[PDB]
C-alpha cells in the first residue's frame, strides 16, 4: 500500500481573489507533506514546508492548512504571475507519492488577436516545401478557430497549432498554425487565407496573399 | 547561496548508457541528503534514488538494479551512472539537495528514442508583411523546423530585444521530427530600420546560424 | 504470406561490430530453422550460421567463434551480433526461413571497409540537347557522383516516370569514390514542357535532394 | 572432404527454345539439392525442389532432372524475362556448398544505340572539375566502342563505362561512359566528340559538342 494522493485540478480565477486546493490521501498519513510551484517549463519551488509552516523567501498570499489527512492549500489576493502547476509530495518516508497537480488559469475580459499570414520564404520553395504561417497575436479567449482556405477551399488535416502560456504581464495568449504543402501542390493553387474566429471579433478576419505577387 | 547546476543530458538507444553530473555549484555535498527526480513531459513528477551523508542507496520502485548513484566530494559532484535505459524514461532530469524537505534543485534534461536523427535546423525568415501589419505595429519572425533533438533555442538580437519575442512550443511532424517559429512584434515604423536577427542554436548538435527578417520584396 | 524484412546494416572498421535484425514480418519465428546467408559482390553464395527450434548454433567455417545468433520470439526478431570483422566480409547479407530447402529470405547490406567518408552526392543536371535528340525523343538524365557509402538512389519524379529511366552501375574511381549517372528518354515535343526533377536520396547519410533537368541554354 | 558442385555458365539463347544446364557433385551424393533464381540485385527464390519436384508458384517451364549425381535442369519455350544467375545447393547437411552460377544471355538480331552527349554543367566546373558524360540507348550487340576525341585527338584512360542489365521488355542494353578532366584541363580544349561503334551502324556515330557555346 502506498498513498495516492489526488487534487482537483483546473483551476480558473481572476486577480485579487481566492482560491483553495485541496489534496487528498488515500491513506492514513500525520501531517508532514509540502507544496510546491512549478512555472512551466522550469524547476519546482517549494512554498508549503511539512505542514503550513510556510517555507521562507515567499509573499504573503499562502496558507496552507494541514490535518491529518485532508490537506489544502488557499491563495488569497492573486497576482498575475502564478502561471504554473502545484503539487503535493510527502516527506520522511523514502519512496515518496507525488501528487497530480493543478493547473490554475486567469480570467482576462476581452482581447481580440491581432493576425498575421506569412507566405513560404524563397529558400524553402528551393527545398521543395512550402510552410505557410499564420499568427495570432496576444489574446485572452484561447477557443480562437483557425481555418486555413486555398482558394476558397477549406484546408483540413495539413496544419499544427500551437500556443503560448498564458502571458505573466497581460495575460494573454499567442498561437500559430503552420499549414504545410509541396512545393509542387503549393504552385497549384493562388489565394492563401487564413480566417480567424475569435470572440473578440464580431466577425471573422481574414488575412491572405497571392502566391507570387511582390 | 546554493546553485546547483547539472551537465550530461543527450539521446541514446536501449542497452546504453550515460553518466550525470549533478555539480555541486554550491557546498558541502558531503553531507546532505541528495536525490534525483523525475518527470515524464505532460505527466506529473517521480523519484528515483537517493544518496545518503554516509552512503546508502534505496533505489526505485521500475529502477530497481540497472542504476547507480554515487558522489564525489572533494570534486563536489554527484554521479549517476545508468545503463540499459528501456527507452521508457524519455524524461527531464532533476537533482535535488532534501534539507528536510526538498528545494534547491536545479533541472537537465535526456532522451532514450530508439534511432538518432541529430540534424539541426531548417530556418526561414517569416517578412514583417502588412497582412500582419496593423496600425501602429507589424510582426515578424523566424521559422526553424525538421530537427530531432528537441531542446533548440532561437533568440532575437542575440538577446537584445525581449519585448513581443514570444518563441512558441515546437510541433512534432508526422515525419517524426520537431518544428516551431518564434514572432516578434515591431513598430510599423521601424519595419526595416533597425536590427532583427534571430539567432538559432542547436545544443545537441553544433548549429549556429543568424538569419535576418526584412520585408517582403 | 510471409514477407521477411531485415534491418541494421551500414560501414564499420575491423574490430568493430554490429547487431543486425531479421525483423519476422510473418510468423512465428519460434519454431523455424532460420539461417544467415552472405554473398560478396560478383561472388556465389555462402552460409553463416544457423538456429534451431530449440536453441542450437552451428557457425561457418572462418568465421567460427567471433560471430554470435539468437532470436526473440515474442518481439519476432532474430537477433545477429557480430564482432571483430576481419573487414573481409564487406558482403550483401540474406536471412531465410528455412522449410525443408529454404526460400521465403529478404535482402540486406553492409560494408567494412578500414576508412569512413560517408559524406552523399554531387549532383549534376545533364540537360537534353540536340546532341542527345534524334528524331520523337530525346534524353536527359542526372549525375550523381563522389560518394563513399554505396547503397544511393536516384528516381525520376519522386517515382512518376517509369518510362526509360535507366540508372547505370556506380562506377568506383580511383579516388576511392563511387560515381553513377541515372538517364531517361522523352519525347523531343516534350523537352521542357512537363516536370523532370531527379530525387536524391543517400540512405547510409542523409542527403535528399531534388534536381530539375532543362534543356541546355 | 566437402562436395565441389560445378555448372557450365555463360549461356545464350533466343526465345521459345530449349536450353539445359547440369550440375556436377564432386563426391557421391544422393538426390537432394535445389536451383534458384537470381534475377541481378534481388533475392534468390527457388524454383526446383529437393530433386525434381518443382516448388510451387512457379511457371511449366522448369524440368529438374535429378539422380544419384550429375543433376540437371532444363527450361524449354523460353521467355524475356530470366535475366540471372541460377545456382545449385545440398540441403540436408548443415555447412552446405553452393554452385558456381550460370548467367544467361538472350539474342536478339541488331538494333543500334541512340547516341548522346552532355556537356558539364557550370555547377561542376565551379568546384572545379569536368565530367564529359555520352550516352548509348537501347542496343543488342554490347560489344560496342566508345571513343573519346578531344580536339580530335583519341583519349585514353579518362574514362569509365557501365553497361545495364539486359531489358526484361526490348532485350537491349544501355552504355555510359564518362569522360573526367580538370577544370584547367577542360579550358584548354574546344571540340569534345563521342565516337560510337556498333554492329548497327554501318559507320560510326559521332556526337559532339563545342566547349561554350550556347
Known amino acids: 500500500d502506498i498513498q495516492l494522493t489526488q487534487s482537483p485540478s483546473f483551476l480558473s480565477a481572476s486577480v485579487g481573489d481566492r482560491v483553495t486546493i485541496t489534496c487528498?490521501?488515500?491513506?492514513?498519513?500525520?501531517?508532514?507533506?509540502?507544496?510546491y510551484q512549478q512555472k512551466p517549463g522550469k524547476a519546482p519551488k517549494l512554498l508549503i514546508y511539512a505542514a503550513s509552516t510556510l517555507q521562507s523567501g515567499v509573499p504573503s498570499r499562502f496558507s496552507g492548512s494541514g490535518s491529518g489527512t485532508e490537506f489544502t492549500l488557499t491563495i488569497s489576493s492573486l497576482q498575475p504571475e502564478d502561471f504554473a502547476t502545484y503539487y503535493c509530495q510527502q516527506l520522511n518516508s523514502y519512496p515518496p507519492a507525488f501528487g497530480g497537480g493543478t493547473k490554475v488559469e486567469i480570467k482576462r475580459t476581452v482581447a481580440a488577436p491581432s493576425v498575421f499570414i506569412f507566405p513560404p520564404s524563397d529558400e524553402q520553395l528551393k527545398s521543395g516545401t512550402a510552410s505557410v504561417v499564420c499568427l495570432l497575436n496576444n489574446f485572452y479567449p484561447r477557443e480562437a478557430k483557425v481555418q486555413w482556405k486555398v482558394d476558397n477551399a477549406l484546408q483540413s488535416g495539413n496544419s499544427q497549432e500551437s500556443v503560448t502560456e498564458q502571458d505573466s504581464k497581460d495575460s494573454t495568449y499567442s498561437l500559430s498554425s503552420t499549414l504545410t504543402l509541396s512545393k509542387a501542390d503549393y504552385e497549384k493553387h493562388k489565394v492563401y487565407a487564413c480566417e480567424v474566429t475569435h470572440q473578440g471579433l464580431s466577425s471573422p478576419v481574414t488575412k491572405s496573399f497571392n502566391r507570387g505577387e511582390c | 547561496e546554493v546553485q546547483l547546476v547539472e551537465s550530461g543530458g543527450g539521446l541514446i538507444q536501449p542497452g546504453g548508457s550515460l553518466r550525470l553530473s549533478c555539480?555541486?555549484?554550491?557546498?558541502?555535498?558531503?553531507?546532505?541528503?541528495?536525490?534525483?527526480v523525475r518527470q515524464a513531459p505532460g505527466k506529473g513528477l517521480e523519484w528515483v534514488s537517493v544518496i545518503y551523508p554516509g552512503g546508502s542507496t534505496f533505489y526505485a520502485d521500475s529502477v530497481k538494479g540497472r542504476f547507480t548513484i554515487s558522489r564525489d566530494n572533494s570534486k563536489n559532484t554527484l554521479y549517476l551512472q545508468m545503463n540499459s535505459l528501456r527507452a521508457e524514461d524519455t524524461a527531464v532530469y532533476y537533482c535535488a539537495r532534501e534539507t528536510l524537505a526538498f528545494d534547491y534543485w536545479g533541472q537537465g534534461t535526456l532522451v532514450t528514442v530508439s534511432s538518432a536523427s541529430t540534424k539541426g535546423p531548417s530556418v526561414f525568415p517569416l517578412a514583417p508583411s502588412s497582412k500582419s501589419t496593423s496600425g501602429g505595429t507589424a510582426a515578424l519572425g523566424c521559422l526553424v523546423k525538421d530537427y530531432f533533438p528537441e531542446p533548440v533555442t532561437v533568440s532575437w538580437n542575440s538577446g537584445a530585444l525581449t519585448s513581443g519575442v514570444h518563441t512558441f512550443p515546437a510541433v512534432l511532424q508526422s515525419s517524426g521530427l520537431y518544428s516551431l517559429s518564434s514572432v516578434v512584434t515591431v513598430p510599423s515604423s521601424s519595419l526595416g530600420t533597425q536590427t532583427y536577427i534571430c539567432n538559432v542554436n542547436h545544443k545537441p548538435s553544433n548549429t549556429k546560424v543568424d538569419k535576418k527578417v526584412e520585408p517582403k520584396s | 504470406e510471409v514477407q521477411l524484412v531485415e534491418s541494421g546494416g551500414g560501414l564499420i572498421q575491423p574490430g568493430g561490430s554490429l547487431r543486425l535484425s531479421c525483423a519476422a514480418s510473418?510468423?512465428?519465428?519460434?519454431?523455424?530453422?532460420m539461417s544467415w546467408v552472405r554473398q560478396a559482390p560478383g561472388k556465389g553464395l555462402e552460409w553463416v550460421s544457423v538456429i534451431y527450434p530449440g536453441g542450437s548454433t552451428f557457425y561457418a567455417d572462418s568465421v567460427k567463434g567471433r560471430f554470435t545468433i539468437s532470436r526473440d520470439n515474442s518481439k519476432n526478431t532474430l537477433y545477429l551480433q557480430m564482432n571483430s570483422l576481419r573487414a573481409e566480409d564487406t558482403a550483401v547479407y540474406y536471412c531465410a526461413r528455412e522449410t525443408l530447402a529454404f526460400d521465403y529470405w529478404g535482402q540486406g547490406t553492409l560494408v567494412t571497409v578500414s576508412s569512413a567518408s560517408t559524406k552523399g552526392p554531387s549532383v549534376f543536371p545533364l540537360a537534353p540537347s540536340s546532341k542527345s535528340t534524334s528524331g520523337g525523343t530525346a534524353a536527359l538524365g542526372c549525375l550523381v557522383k563522389d560518394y563513399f557509402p554505396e547503397p544511393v538512389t536516384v528516381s525520376w519524379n519522386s517515382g512518376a516516370l517509369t518510362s526509360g529511366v535507366h540508372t547505370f552501375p556506380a562506377v568506383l574511381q580511383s579516388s576511392g569514390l563511387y560515381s553513377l549517372s541515372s538517364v531517361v528518354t522523352v519525347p523531343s515535343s516534350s523537352l521542357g514542357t512537363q516536370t523532370y526533377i531527379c530525387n536524391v536520396n543517400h540512405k547510409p547519410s542523409n542527403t535528399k535532394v531534388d534536381k530539375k533537368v532543362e534543356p541546355k541554354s | 572432404d566437402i562436395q565441389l558442385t560445378q555448372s557450365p555458365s555463360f549461356l545464350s539463347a533466343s526465345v521459345g527454345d530449349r536450353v539445359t544446364i547440369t550440375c556436377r557433385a564432386s563426391?557421391?551424393?544422393?538426390?537432394?539439392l535445389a536451383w534458384y533464381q537470381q534475377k541481378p540485385g534481388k533475392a534468390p527464390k527457388l524454383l526446383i525442389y529437393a530433386a525434381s519436384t518443382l516448388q510451387s508458384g512457379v511457371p511449366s517451364r522448369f524440368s529438374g532432372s535429378g539422380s544419384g549425381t550429375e543433376f540437371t535442369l532444363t527450361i524449354s519455350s523460353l521467355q524475356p524475362e530470366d535475366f540471372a544467375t541460377y545456382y545449385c545447393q545440398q540441403l540436408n547437411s548443415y555447412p552446405p556448398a553452393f554452385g558456381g552460377g550460370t548467367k544467361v544471355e538472350i539474342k536478339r538480331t541488331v538494333a543500334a544505340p541512340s547516341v548522346f552527349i552532355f556537356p558539364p554543367s557550370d555547377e561542376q566546373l565551379k568546384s572545379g572539375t569536368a565530367s564529359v558524360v555520352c550516352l548509348l540507348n537501347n542496343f543488342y550487340p554490347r560489344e560496342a566502342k566508345v571513343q573519346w576525341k578531344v580536339d580530335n585527338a583519341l583519349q585514353s584512360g579518362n574514362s569509365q563505362e557501365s553497361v545495364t542489365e539486359q531489358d526484361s521488355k526490348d532485350s537491349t542494353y544501355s552504355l555510359s561512359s564518362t569522360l573526367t578532366l580538370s577544370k584547367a584541363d577542360y579550358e584548354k580544349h574546344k571540340v569534345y566528340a563521342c565516337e560510337v561503334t556498333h554492329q548497327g551502324l554501318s559507320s560510326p556515330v559521332t556526337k559532339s559538342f563545342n566547349r561554350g557555346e550556347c
Open positions: 563426391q557421391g551424393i544422393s538426390s537432394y
Open positions: 510473418g510468423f512465428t519465428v519460434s519454431s523455424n530453422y
